[PDB]
Design an enzyme around this catalytic site. Structure first.
Site, short mmCIF file in Angstrom:
data_model
loop_
_atom_site.label_atom_id
_atom_site.label_comp_id
_atom_site.label_asym_id
_atom_site.label_seq_id
_atom_site.Cartn_x
_atom_site.Cartn_y
_atom_site.Cartn_z
N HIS A 142 88.44 11.69 57.70
CA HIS A 142 87.91 13.04 57.55
C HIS A 142 87.97 13.77 58.89
CE1 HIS A 142 84.81 15.95 55.79
NE2 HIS A 142 84.69 16.19 57.08
N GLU A 143 87.53 13.12 59.97
CA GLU A 143 87.50 13.78 61.27
C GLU A 143 88.90 14.06 61.78
OE1 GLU A 143 84.68 14.85 61.70
OE2 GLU A 143 83.62 13.43 60.40
N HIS A 146 90.47 17.07 60.24
CA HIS A 146 90.12 18.38 60.80
C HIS A 146 91.13 18.81 61.86
CE1 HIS A 146 86.51 19.54 58.71
NE2 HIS A 146 85.86 18.43 59.01
N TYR A 157 86.27 28.06 59.75
CA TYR A 157 85.21 27.15 59.29
C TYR A 157 83.98 27.90 58.79
CZ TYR A 157 83.08 22.48 59.07
OH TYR A 157 82.48 21.30 58.70
N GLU A 166 86.83 21.68 54.58
CA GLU A 166 86.04 20.49 54.28
C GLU A 166 86.68 19.63 53.20
OE1 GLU A 166 83.99 19.67 57.03
OE2 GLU A 166 83.41 18.61 55.18
N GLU A 177 91.36 6.01 52.74
CA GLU A 177 90.59 4.88 52.25
C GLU A 177 91.35 4.09 51.19
OE1 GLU A 177 86.30 5.38 51.80
OE2 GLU A 177 86.38 4.35 49.86
N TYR A 193 76.29 5.32 55.09
CA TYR A 193 75.17 6.15 54.68
C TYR A 193 74.03 5.29 54.15
CZ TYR A 193 73.07 10.30 52.35
OH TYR A 193 72.26 11.32 51.93
N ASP A 226 74.80 26.27 56.55
CA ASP A 226 75.98 25.39 56.56
C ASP A 226 77.27 26.21 56.61
OD1 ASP A 226 77.53 22.94 56.38
OD2 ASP A 226 77.48 23.11 54.17
N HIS A 231 80.09 22.41 53.35
CA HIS A 231 79.94 21.05 52.84
C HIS A 231 79.36 21.01 51.44
CE1 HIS A 231 79.87 20.49 57.30
NE2 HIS A 231 80.57 19.40 57.02
C1 LIG Z 1 82.17 12.74 56.71
C2 LIG Z 1 80.75 12.93 57.25
C3 LIG Z 1 80.04 11.60 57.45
C4 LIG Z 1 80.75 13.73 58.54
C5 LIG Z 1 81.10 15.20 58.36
N1 LIG Z 1 81.18 15.83 59.68
P1 LIG Z 1 82.14 17.16 59.97
O1 LIG Z 1 82.31 17.88 58.65
O2 LIG Z 1 83.47 16.84 60.59
C6 LIG Z 1 81.16 18.19 61.12
N2 LIG Z 1 82.05 19.11 61.78
C7 LIG Z 1 81.65 20.38 62.16
O3 LIG Z 1 80.56 20.82 62.04
O4 LIG Z 1 82.73 21.02 62.73
C8 LIG Z 1 82.51 22.27 63.35
C9 LIG Z 1 82.75 22.13 64.86
C10 LIG Z 1 81.99 21.29 65.65
C11 LIG Z 1 82.20 21.19 67.00
C12 LIG Z 1 83.21 21.93 67.61
C13 LIG Z 1 84.01 22.75 66.84
C14 LIG Z 1 83.76 22.86 65.46
C15 LIG Z 1 80.08 15.88 57.47
O5 LIG Z 1 80.21 15.96 56.28
N3 LIG Z 1 78.95 16.32 58.15
C16 LIG Z 1 77.86 16.97 57.45
C17 LIG Z 1 76.68 16.03 57.27
C18 LIG Z 1 76.10 15.61 58.60
N4 LIG Z 1 74.79 14.99 58.48
C19 LIG Z 1 77.50 18.26 58.16
O6 LIG Z 1 77.95 18.49 59.31
O7 LIG Z 1 76.73 19.05 57.56
CA LIG Z 2 73.45 3.79 51.19
CA LIG Z 3 84.70 6.50 50.28
CA LIG Z 4 84.64 2.71 49.77
ZN LIG Z 5 84.18 17.93 57.97
#
Ligand SMILES: CC(C)C[C@H](NP(=O)(O)CNC(=O)OCc1ccccc1)C(=O)N[C@@H](CCN)C(=O)O
Ligand SMILES: [Ca+2]
Ligand SMILES: [Ca+2]
Ligand SMILES: [Ca+2]
Ligand SMILES: [Zn+2]
Ligand SMILES: [Ca+2]
Length: 316
Positions: A142-143, A146, A157, A166, A177, A193, A226, A231
């Site tokens: 996922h990361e 991005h 975003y 997202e 996966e 999680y 958000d 998300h």
């Molecule tokens: C897959 C899960 C475990 C992680 C995921 N993280 P992400 O989407 O990549 C968070 N990226 C984000 O904000 O990027 C903007 C940004 C940040 C810094 C610099 C430039 C731009 C997510 O779903 N997070 C949630 C849940 C977190 N508790 C959530 O942030 O609300």
């Molecule tokens: Ca769990």
């Molecule tokens: Ca999974």
């Molecule tokens: Ca799995």
């Molecule tokens: Zn993300």
């Protein structure tokens, strides 16, 4: 660093043993020279200054508890690189074998992971909502996805473009996966999680509403939390992607599934050839239809199923 390529062994967040590509020069570093211009993993040492220090180890064995998030960030970045190269003929996130950098042990009790514009960053979690987040292959992918998005479509975003951003990360996180083929599912983040709760996850692509996320455009979030629900509204696109791959009848609309591989081909082409920074959900539908037409032909089942899936989630 300049050195010679080596192979270390360690244990990841979930206790599993794996080999890791390292580099020897006095110390053994988490620097994998076998992929592109390298994969580099750093210790942020519970602080927020990035990237921290390139991970150094005296003996090339990575079995300490403190090592586990680094082992997994490093190893799963390699798997994700391999997926993009082998499946999509894409060399790293920029298509030109850019070095892939990750930092682990970011901050204290940090329940998130992110791409910061230049690198991946993983918290350790607070031990209740998350354990160290690099333990999830879908999270790592996922990361990195991005970064792929940012170099390609460039989806802003916020609001619908941000929910597409997202969903693209959840889609390819899931396809990675499945590529690694260890306990694959259509859930997001389940391996890291809520260690005290079995059977849950952060999001579900097969049934987004299980965790309060919309599964139809008529249920989209329109507020400002958000980044305008990036998300949350991702559930609408995640559901469409799930239906394209797996099929189903959703709000009375039947979708004939075409499988994961074709899903990935369609969405990769949409991302890299048709989407733009400001694409909305309707424009994603059009991009997916055009991509499937390019790949499979206008009269194909694949095109028909893309249309069915977007109809099922209320996106015209
Ligand atoms: C897959 C899960 C475990 C992680 C995921 N993280 P992400 O989407 O990549 C968070 N990226 C984000 O904000 O990027 C903007 C940004 C940040 C810094 C610099 C430039 C731009 C997510 O779903 N997070 C949630 C849940 C977190 N508790 C959530 O942030 O609300
Ligand atoms: Ca769990
Ligand atoms: Ca999974
Ligand atoms: Ca799995
Ligand atoms: Zn993300
Ligand atoms: Ca060691």
């Amino acid at each position: 660093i300049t050195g010679t390529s080596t192979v270390g062994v360690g244990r990841g967040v979930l206790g599993d043993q794996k080999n890791i590509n390292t580099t020897y020069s006095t110390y053994y570093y988490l620097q994998d020279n076998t992929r592109g211009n390298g994969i580099f993993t750093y210790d942020a040492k519970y602080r927020t200054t990035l990237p921290g220090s390139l991970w150094a180890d005296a003996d090339n064995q990575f079995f300490a508890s403190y090592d586990a998030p680094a082992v997994d960030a490093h190893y799963y970045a390699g798997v994700t690189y391999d997926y993009y190269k082998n499946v999509h003929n894409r060399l790293s996130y920029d298509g030109n074998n850019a070095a892939i950098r990750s930092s682990v042990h970011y901050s204290q009790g940090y329940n998130n992971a992110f791409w910061n514009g230049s690198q991946m960053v993983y918290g350790d979690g607070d031990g209740q909502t998350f354990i160290p987040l690099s333990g999830g292959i879908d999270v790592v992918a996922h990361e990195l996805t991005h970064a792929v998005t940012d170099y390609t479509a460039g989806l802003i975003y916020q609001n619908e473009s941000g929910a597409i951003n997202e969903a693209i990360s959840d889609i390819f996180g899931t396809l990675v996966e499945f590529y690694a083929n260890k306990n694959p599912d259509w859930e997001i983040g389940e391996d890291v999680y809520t260690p005290g709760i079995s059977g849950d996850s952060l999001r579900s692509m097969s049934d987004p509403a299980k965790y309060g996320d919309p599964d139809h455009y008529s249920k989209r979030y329109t507020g400002t939390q958000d980044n305008g629900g990036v998300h949350i509204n991702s559930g609408i696109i995640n559901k469409a992607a799930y239906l394209i791959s797996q099929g189903g009848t959703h709000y009375g609309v039947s979708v004939v599934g075409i499988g994961r591989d074709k899903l990935g081909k369609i969405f990769y082409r949409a991302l890299t050839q048709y989407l733009t920074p400001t694409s909305n959900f309707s424009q994603l539908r059009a991009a997916a239809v055009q991509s499937a037409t390019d790949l499979y032909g206008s009269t194909s089942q694949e095109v028909a199923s893309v249309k069915q899936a977007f109809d099922a989630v209320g996106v015209k």
